[PDB]
Amino acid sequence: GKTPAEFAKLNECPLDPGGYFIVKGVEKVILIQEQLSKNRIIVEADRKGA
Amino acid sequence: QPSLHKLSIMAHLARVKPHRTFRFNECVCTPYNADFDGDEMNLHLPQTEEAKAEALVLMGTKANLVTPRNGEPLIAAIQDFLTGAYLLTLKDTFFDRAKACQIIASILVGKDEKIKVRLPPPTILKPVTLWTGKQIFSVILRPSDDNPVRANLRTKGKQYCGKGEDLCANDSYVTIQNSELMSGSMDKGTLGSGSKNNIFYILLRDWGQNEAADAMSRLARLAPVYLSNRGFSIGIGDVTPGQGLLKAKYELLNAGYKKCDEYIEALNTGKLQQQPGCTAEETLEALILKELSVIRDHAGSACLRELDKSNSPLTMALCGSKGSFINISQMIACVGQQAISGSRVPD
Amino acid sequence: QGRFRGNLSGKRVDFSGRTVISPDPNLRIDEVAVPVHVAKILTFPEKVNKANINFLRK
Amino acid sequence: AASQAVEEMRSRVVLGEFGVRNVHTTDFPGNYSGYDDAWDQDRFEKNFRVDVVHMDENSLEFDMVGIDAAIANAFRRILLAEVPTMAVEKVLVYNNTSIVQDEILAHRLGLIPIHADPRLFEYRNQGDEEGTEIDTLQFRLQVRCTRNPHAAKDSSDPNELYVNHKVYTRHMTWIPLGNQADLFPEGTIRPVHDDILIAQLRPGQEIDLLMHCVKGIGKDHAKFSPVATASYRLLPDITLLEPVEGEAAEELSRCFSPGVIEVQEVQGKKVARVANPRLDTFSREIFRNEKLKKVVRLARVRDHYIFSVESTGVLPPDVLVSEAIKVLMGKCRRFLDELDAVQ
Amino acid sequence: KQAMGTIGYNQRNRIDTLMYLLAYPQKPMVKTKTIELIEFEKLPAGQNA
Amino acid sequence: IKAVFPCPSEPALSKNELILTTESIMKKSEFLCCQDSFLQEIKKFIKGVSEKIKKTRD
Amino acid sequence: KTALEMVQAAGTDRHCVTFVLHEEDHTLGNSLRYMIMKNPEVEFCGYTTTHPSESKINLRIQTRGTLPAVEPFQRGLNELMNVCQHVLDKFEASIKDYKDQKA
Amino acid sequence: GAAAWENVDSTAESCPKCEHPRAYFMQLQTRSADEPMTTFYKCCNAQCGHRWR
Amino acid sequence: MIIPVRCFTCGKIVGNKWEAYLGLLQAEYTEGDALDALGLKRYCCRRMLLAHVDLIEKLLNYAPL
Amino acid sequence: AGILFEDIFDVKDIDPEGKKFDRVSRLHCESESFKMDLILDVNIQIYPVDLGDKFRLVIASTLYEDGTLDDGEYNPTDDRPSRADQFEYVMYGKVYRIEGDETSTEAATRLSAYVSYGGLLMRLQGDANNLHGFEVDSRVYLLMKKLA
Amino acid sequence: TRRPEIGDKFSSRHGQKGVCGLIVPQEDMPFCDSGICPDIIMNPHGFPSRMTVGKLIELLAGKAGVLDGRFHYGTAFGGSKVKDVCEDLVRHGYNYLGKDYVTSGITGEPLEAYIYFGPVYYQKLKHMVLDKMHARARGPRAVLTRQP
RNA sequence: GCUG
Ligand SMILES: [Zn+2]
Ligand SMILES: [Zn+2]
């Protein structure tokens, strides 16, 4: 909720996306993990073709 | 760094130069599979006299012009050394005495600095004194009167019609008699790395490894100078579809789409002759694929027919330096059926 | 990384260098341009004898 | 006839739909059957003429007729790279507190042009950093940005809010060395433009520096080049092969540049004539129109070159061309002296 | 992703392990609408050649 | 070999002459050292060339 | 040591000689080549830069008969100097005339 | 059957081996280490049977 | 960050023109017409003013002052 | 003399398979005096040939009619009386293939001579008695003058 | 502060990456009638195999844009069309397909082919040869295996 | 993780 004139007091860039942490001075992003949907009936072939 | 065969590591004579990169003649790009796009290469300095000799005699580039596999040359001409040579040896090229000398004088550097240059007799005499560009090319194969090389080659070019027997309309039959180019332009199949019938290979066996290496060096000097001063460029005009193709495509596409619909109708409601060994659906795919692929083939021929000579894309396909008639037809006329694992796009 | 492959079958070597490559058609096919910064480092042990004594002095 | 075909080959470069034909210069001894092309100094002197089409401060346009491309290209190459000028080589920096990096600020100062005349100064020897009155010029730039004491409350504009907010080339002040002050009257040695923006400052930020200017040629660095651009174009010679009349004249006038083709109603019927071929920019749009492509020929006279020189303001453009001819003459003289030394 | 350019407006007050900047950046002469949405033409990475 | 060494001062051999001359050279020891199958291939090629000479001269 | 003349062969045949010109580029070589190729005696004249890095041009003059090749090269340098002297005088006269009409 | 073999587009083109019109072509692109295109051709007018790149 | 002093290809001084160009744009002048008034006839020179992004003003907001 | 062959030729076609090149055209010609057909490439920029033209074509071993075969080098600059002063077009090339007519299985007399003028080809085909004096690896001057 | 040298990687917004191979003076570049000489010369051989027609249009749309103070859009499945930018170039006196009459800077004689000229966005990549040149003569060794 |  800051204005671009008040980002300048904080030494931050209005265009900087955020969405990341600062932990011990390094910027770290939690990446989006792709997963399978739990609670769903998979119907698939075994190795042996059953 | 990745070595798939023995020619990926070779021994070279060092020469010290100021700039930071490693540099070598682009004829040796094909053995290393190098492409100058920020590529890195390794260098090793053998610390022993016995290791110099084994490197020089066994691993030298002049001793390794041919791959061990099928015995075909890998150090040969590449892009802008095939295109410049092709455009030089075309029948339309004529040079006066001032420009003949200024192309030939490029070779007079290094160990050729002491030779007398042997400007050949002109072809045309009375109206004007002209040198045909094939003669300038022959100075590569024999640059001085004391040079013993007498190369001989006789082979079919890339765009040979099959009936000319040195009188073809495409000027695509090569004769090199006593190191003089009597007919035919120089393509990939004659100056390049693809296969035999390559002048460099013929010299290698006939006149030894050193004579073959010298020619490759001489062409590399001569080809850039001709192209740099003639000019080759590609522009949106070159790839722009002409009116003839624009009409033809509409007709071909409409006809093809209609035929496909009929075949679709039969499978949906009726009898489609099931091709041997296949289900009806499989058959429909085959019939549809042929009609589409036939439309693509028809739309491609039309574009090539109207593309004017001097279209740069066409030249590079004919001489084989880069690209093919598929690529031209694909960016001008029609991109093909997109196929994943050899079939139409799965659901 | 085991002794058989990492330290025996393939091993790191000295008197070696690496750089970006770039074209030069004015060199012969048997030649390679080496930069001065690599050439001042990569040395070859020349044994002194009657043919090279006055050359190695310079 | 065939004689007509050869005359075009040796005299006109013909622009075509796909390529430019007759590009090479073929006037050398023995290249033709009935023509003598051996050098004749008397013939060259009679044929050569230089005409000044236009001269304004910082721009000279002239035509050289009867000169060859190789001699003409040398003049363009000498003007761009071998005519000497004075430019900043070393910047000594004390107290640079600006946002602009000192290496970037040093590069910007080297690019700025100096109005000092190069012929008066001499080339500095290798090393010899200290320099002498003859070989160098010293310029000192000291600017400190301060808030304007009397300012409006809003102060949205930086110019009202701050004094010395922008460093301009006017701030640079010449420091005379030795007898230079007497030799050059006040204002002779100054940056040519006076408005180039070296840097931008905020209150409390100061740039203090001393610059040494040395004579150099364009080959070493582009900062020493004396011409914004020097180029030559062969004179256009459009010829209408067949008389063109009617609405065709209007389309033919449209295909070419704005003033080259003038349509005149000789009998109340429009007819096309070529009035000012020099203005033609050779867009070659005539080839787009199928009917007019065969009725006109686009060609350039090979031996008439229109040369355009735009100076950076360091010295008058006419003097620059004269200096370029002298530099080429000097190179030939040096080699002749070496031949005399050898023999 | 690897082109030299401008990290942001705080780039001079920023101390990082390794930072690359282009001295005189220019904005693209031909541009997408996506370039205007992400505001790439405010801190561009390249020069017209 | 025909183009590097054309011999304008020498006669053109007939089909019988070409076969006879080849046999005389083939009997030399250096040819015997080479595998017989390779020698047979040369003889078959020479026989084919000799047949072409007759067809033309007929 | 700007000019080093290398004869074609050990026999030192004068007709073919390569002049290596130090601190030179296409500007002197191309202009000299045109002046020395307008000589009837010179059968072949060409210039080659050994490498872009080194500022040297090798100029090879092959004469028609017994001329030493120094004589054609020297005559070409003399002709280039005369062409430059004429252009400078003609250019200066034309520039002065233009300013006078403007005044 | 031969008709079951030649129900593919290409005919009357040129192979680099035997130049015959009755042909059976193929095109691939699915290796982006190969920035050039990929083709393979079959040529069976004289039943010569080449299969190259 | 700041307007380049000389055009990269031609070498014309374009540092002086930035202040005038901004002022002409502040008035009704069109971008093509503004470049024409400054005298930047060749395309190489025009792109330098047209494509320049002025970050010095934005960066200075974060400068110490 | 040093003349090998000489006849008057009439042009019968200019481009059989279209205009493949700008400067060069493939002239197919037939001779009056003998039954000789001629394939000839000429530079039609310097020398323009039309579909009805009749020309005289001499092939000569030496360009000086006194029969001196002294050709160490050809000097364009040198001016002496020669054969080329009577002819409009001249080319220098090498005879490179003599080949027999394949089109009859018995009792044939037609021969083909091929000359290459730096890549501009000529096929001269006719009775063996008229092609006498051609030999492979020999160098010949073509000479050519159009007739009114 | 680093200045571009041989071996520095540049790229061009269409996957046409390429290391610097030679740096030539302004006096040796080809130049147009207006005096423009290129900052970069790009080899035409990249385009046929790779079919980057969008680079060919970007050069044309940009050129028509700098000449009239516009930013032409290149948005996917849309963008400014070739037919519009061709008419902008001819209005400003350039050829509609961007090809120009180019003179050789080496010889002064004009080039035969017209050369495509325009502004193409080029981005400098982080890979520089100064940060990558490496050499070892002899030096420190690992403690376990006494090898480099 | 990315370049090779
Ligand atoms: Zn096949
Ligand atoms: Zn500019």
Swiss-Prot record, chain D:
Source taxon at top rank: Eukaryota
Alphabetical list of CDD domains matching this protein: RNAP_I_II_AC40 (cd07032)
Signal peptide: none
PROSITE patterns (alphabetical): RNA_POL_D_30KD (PS00446)
Keywords of the record: Acetylation, Cytoplasm, Disease variant, DNA-directed RNA polymerase, Leukodystrophy, Nucleus, Phosphoprotein, Transcription
A GO CC term attached to the entry: RNA polymerase I complex
Effect the entry attributes to changing N73S: In HLD11; decreased localization to the nucleus and retained in the cytoplasm; loss of association with RNA polymerase III-transcribed genes; decreased association with RNA polymerase III complex; probably prevents RNA polymerase III complex assembly and activity
Residues bearing the modification Phosphoserine: S3
Cellular compartment(s): Nucleus; Nucleus, Nucleolus; Cytoplasm, Cytosol
One biological process term in Gene Ontology: transcription by RNA polymerase I
SMART domains per the UniProt record, alphabetical: RPOLD (SM00662)
UniProt keyword Transferase, yes or no: no
Pfam assignment, any one: RNA_pol_A_bac
In-chain residues carrying the UniProt-annotated modification N-acetylalanine: A1
Molecular function via GO: DNA binding; DNA-directed RNA polymerase activity; protein dimerization activity
Oligomeric form and interacting partners: Component of the RNA polymerase I and RNA polymerase III complexes consisting of at least 13 and 17 subunits, respectively. Pol I complex consists of a ten-subunit catalytic core composed of POLR1A/RPA1, POLR1B/RPA2, POLR1C/RPAC1, POLR1D/RPAC2, POLR1H/RPA12, POLR2E/RPABC1, POLR2F/RPABC2, POLR2H/RPABC3, POLR2K/RPABC4 and POLR2L/RPABC5; a mobile stalk subunit POLR1F/RPA43 protruding from the core and additional subunits homologous to general transcription factors POLR1E/RPA49 and POLR1G/RPA34.
Family classification: Belongs to the archaeal Rpo3/eukaryotic RPB3 RNA polymerase subunit family.
Chain's gene name: POLR1C
Swiss-Prot record, chain G:
Any Gene Ontology CC annotation: RNA polymerase III complex
GO biological process, one term: transcription by RNA polymerase III
Keywords for the protein's UniProt record, in alphabetical order: Acetylation, Disease variant, DNA-directed RNA polymerase, Nucleus, Transcription
A GO MF label: DNA-directed RNA polymerase activity
Lineage: superkingdom: Eukaryota
Localization: Nucleus; Nucleus, Nucleolus
Keyword Acetylation in annotation: yes
Disease: Treacher Collins syndrome 2: A form of Treacher Collins syndrome, a disorder of craniofacial development. Treacher Collins syndrome is characterized by a combination of bilateral downward slanting of the palpebral fissures, colobomas of the lower eyelids with a paucity of eyelashes medial to the defect, hypoplasia of the facial bones, cleft palate, malformation of the external ears, atresia of the external auditory canals, and bilateral conductive hearing loss.
Primary role: DNA-dependent RNA polymerase catalyzes the transcription of DNA into RNA using the four ribonucleoside triphosphates as substrates. Common component of RNA polymerases I and III which synthesize ribosomal RNA precursors and short non-coding RNAs including 5S rRNA, snRNAs, tRNAs and miRNAs, respectively.
Family in the record: Belongs to the archaeal Rpo11/eukaryotic RPB11/RPC19 RNA polymerase subunit family.
Protein name in the entry: DNA-directed RNA polymerases I and III subunit RPAC2
Organism this protein belongs to: Homo sapiens
Section of the entire sequence shown: 24 to 126 of 133
UniProtKB/Swiss-Prot annotation, chain J:
Gene Ontology CC terms, in alphabetical order: cytosol; nucleoplasm; nucleus; protein-DNA complex; RNA polymerase I complex; RNA polymerase II, core complex; RNA polymerase III complex
Keyword line: Acetylation, DNA-binding, DNA-directed RNA polymerase, Nucleus, Transcription
Main location: nucleus
Pfam family, one: RNA_pol_Rpb8
Residue numbers of N-acetylalanine PTMs: A1
Localization annotation: Nucleus; Nucleus, Nucleolus
MF term (GO), any: DNA-directed RNA polymerase activity
Positions of the UniProt region annotated as Non-specific ssDNA binding: 15-39
UniProt GO BP: transcription by RNA polymerase II
UniProt superkingdom: Eukaryota
UniProt signal peptide: none
InterPro entries cross-referenced by the UniProt entry: NA-bd_OB-fold, RPABC3
SMART domains listed in its UniProt record: RPOL8c (SM00658)
Family listed: Belongs to the eukaryotic RPB8 RNA polymerase subunit family.
Subunit-structure text: Component of the RNA polymerase I (Pol I), RNA polymerase II (Pol II) and RNA polymerase III (Pol III) complexes consisting of at least 13, 12 and 17 subunits, respectively. Pol I complex consists of a ten-subunit catalytic core composed of POLR1A/RPA1, POLR1B/RPA2, POLR1C/RPAC1, POLR1D/RPAC2, POLR1H/RPA12, POLR2E/RPABC1, POLR2F/RPABC2, POLR2H/RPABC3, POLR2K/RPABC4 and POLR2L/RPABC5; a mobile stalk subunit POLR1F/RPA43 protruding from the core and additional subunits homologous to general transcription factors POLR1E/RPA49 and POLR1G/RPA34.
Record protein name field: DNA-directed RNA polymerases I, II, and III subunit RPABC3
Organism: Homo sapiens
UniProtKB/Swiss-Prot annotation, chain K:
Residues holding RNA: K9, K17, K132
Localization (cell): Nucleus; Cytoplasm, Cytosol
Coiled-coil intervals, chain numbering: none
Family note: Belongs to the RNA polymerase beta chain family.
Cited function: Catalytic core component of RNA polymerase III (Pol III), a DNA-dependent RNA polymerase which synthesizes small non-coding RNAs using the four ribonucleoside triphosphates as substrates. Synthesizes 5S rRNA, snRNAs, tRNAs and miRNAs from at least 500 distinct genomic loci. Pol III-mediated transcription cycle proceeds through transcription initiation, transcription elongation and transcription termination stages. During transcription initiation, Pol III is recruited to DNA promoters type I, II or III with the help of general transcription factors and other specific initiation factors.
Disease: Leukodystrophy, hypomyelinating, 8, with or without oligodontia and/or hypogonadotropic hypogonadism: An autosomal recessive neurodegenerative disorder characterized by early childhood onset of cerebellar ataxia and mild intellectual disabilities associated with diffuse hypomyelination apparent on brain MRI. Variable features include oligodontia and/or hypogonadotropic hypogonadism.
Protein name, as recorded: DNA-directed RNA polymerase III subunit RPC2
Species of provenance: Homo sapiens (Human)
Lineage: Eukaryota, Metazoa, Chordata, Craniata, Vertebrata
